[PDB]
Design a protein around this ligand. Structure first.
Ligand SMILES: NC(=O)c1ccc[n+]([C@@H]2O[C@H](COP(=O)([O-])OP(=O)(O)OC[C@H]3O[C@@H](n4cnc5c(N)ncnc54)[C@H](O)[C@@H]3O)[C@@H](O)[C@H]2O)c1
Ligand SMILES: NC(=O)c1ccc[n+]([C@@H]2O[C@H](COP(=O)([O-])OP(=O)(O)OC[C@H]3O[C@@H](n4cnc5c(N)ncnc54)[C@H](O)[C@@H]3O)[C@@H](O)[C@H]2O)c1
Lengths: 288, 287
């Protein structure tokens, strides 16, 4: 890349982040399209976040990605939030449209976009959502807003159970999608849920390093063919869940899929251009 | 350049700016040394400057360059200024050291460096400074600090005249150099100086488009060989001042040399490294 006075800046505000891959990925996509943008990472926490936004505006940055621990706080500094973001209550993308700041959660749109790109239609379907954190909430919010008939959220009795309930409330009160929350301990309600589910989505940490050798699904007999299973965990690339999904004839979507489309969604929001997904997938070494 | 999450930001706050060459020049130099920094220009004016400084600190930028029209205002937003910066009253460089901002004016140090680099010792010498703008003021303050004998400043009857007056006072009260503000209209008193001068420095817009074929020097007469003629205008690389210069046999220092050294200084202030000046010169075609 050759940066000149013409280039505008796109940030990523989080902490820690100096070891983030996003900058390399977006800058590779940007250079490929020969666009006058540069994507950079800045160490920002809740204390400096306010001033960083003030910077975003004064310096006229095109926008910035947002990650831990500013995801929720960020909602307070934009001028407008999308419906899905309002349900999630957290954003990972900000777009500065000439001083007017728009907040987005591309984790939700990217996951669903990955689904649709596979030829799958979520309209009127049923999803078994594992989790209630940022990934799950974002997936579910977007999913509801895109047509899901019902979401059967399952979450253990931890610090996320109450968030689940509220999420269920917000979604039910502002969408035509019906959301229910069930304790992941009620193994009976789970099996039946999965049997009636068109999509099984894992938004939990389960399956991710170092606790890779584990899956929230007891036995492969719980899954059925035709069923679509999506994994948020992309580390390992092949979780246990995804491994079982194959041993059941289930179609699937891995973590890299959500990652690339999540990044593609931001790319388009900032440049208005399509994402060179294939190229980026290849250059970042995700194909193997 | 391959920007990653490890690169730190170095900006340029000014407006207009999207057509500046500092970015490429600084980014060519940085990539040349494989340094984890990226120089970027931001369209910022007096109104956005306060917010821009908040970003500089909050985003933890390594620093930023400052140009029109934020040079003067920038002094009010730093924690510490250099003696020259205080005399000049404006800065073009800001360095952020873990939250503390230091202001510098490399225009002066840069122009003086170019002088010294040609084998000239400004100490105890007389200079005829044309203009009182950002350039002239920077060169003068720095030149004074570095031993200049006296500064005979010449500026027309515009708003800068008063600026010249105020500038003369500041220097004459904090340096051993003696400055005098003379009306560029007194064509007579201009000879009395240009005659007994060691160096003639132009920091006015004359010489630069749309004032190309113009010069504050009526006849080659007033100028002879050996005389040092420094030109700040670099737009028309060969200003009418140079024509008369490289025709009267007076060694000169074009705006390219000043530009390169003023940039070298900022580079080093930010990265702590030596500026690949020769490399940049060639790549930027300044050669
Ligand atoms: N592919 C992508 O682009 C992408 C994007 C975002 C997050 N992720 C991944 O998704 C996962 C979730 O991230 P998050 O931000 O939503 O996390 P979070 O901490 O906000 O949520 C963790 C969730 O998982 C559940 N959970 C964790 N351990 C559990 C266990 N042992 N048993 C039952 N439930 C458990 C919790 O109840 C909670 O709802 C992470 O592995 C993350 O790396 C991937
Ligand atoms: N070498 C470098 O890196 C460098 C740095 C800064 C400025 N410059 C150049 O130097 C010039 C001056 O820049 P500045 O920032 O000092 O400008 P400024 O606006 O601050 O000052 C303009 C000066 O020129 C004088 N002037 C303008 N028209 C005049 C005229 N017709 N007759 C007599 N005097 C006249 C004014 O009195 C004033 O003192 C510009 O052309 C600029 O491109 C070069």
């Amino acid at each position: 890349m050759d940066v000149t006075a013409k280039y505008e800046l796109i940030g990523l505000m989080a902490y820690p982040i100096r070891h983030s891959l996003s900058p390399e990925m977006q800058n590779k996509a940007l250079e490929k399209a020969g666009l006058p943008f540069t994507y950079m990472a800045f160490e920002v926490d809740n204390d400096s976040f306010p001033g960083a936004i003030e910077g975003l505006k004064a310096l006229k940055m095109r926008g910035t990605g947002v990650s831990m621990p500013n995801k929720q706080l960020a909602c307070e500094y934009v001028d407008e939030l999308t419906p899905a973001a309002k349900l999630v209550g957290a954003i990972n993308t900000i777009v500065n449209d000439d001083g007017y700041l728009r907040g987005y959660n591309t984790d939700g749109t990217g996951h669903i976009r990955a689904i649709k790109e596979s030829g799958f239609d979520i309209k009127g379907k049923t999803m078994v959502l594992l989790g209630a954190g940022g990934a799950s909430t974002a997936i579910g919010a977007q999913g509801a807003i895109e047509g899901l008939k019902e979401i059967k959220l399952f979450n253990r009795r931890d610090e996320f159970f109450d968030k689940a309930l509220a999420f269920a409330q917000r979604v039910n009160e502002n969408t035509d999608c019906v959301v229910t929350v069930t304790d992941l301990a009620d193994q009976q309600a789970f099996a039946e849920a999965l049997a009636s589910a068109d999509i099984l989505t894992n938004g939990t940490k389960v399956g991710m390093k170092p606790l890779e050798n584990e899956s929230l699904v007891n036995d492969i007999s719980l899954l059925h063919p035709g069923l679509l299973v999506t994994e948020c965990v992309y580390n390992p690339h092949m979780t246990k869940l995804l491994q079982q999904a194959q041993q059941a004839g289930c179609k699937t979507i891995d973590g890299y899929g959500m990652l690339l489309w999540q990044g593609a969604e931001q790319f388009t929001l900032w440049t208005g251009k399509d994402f060179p997904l294939e190229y980026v997938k290849q250059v970042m070494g995700f194909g193997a």
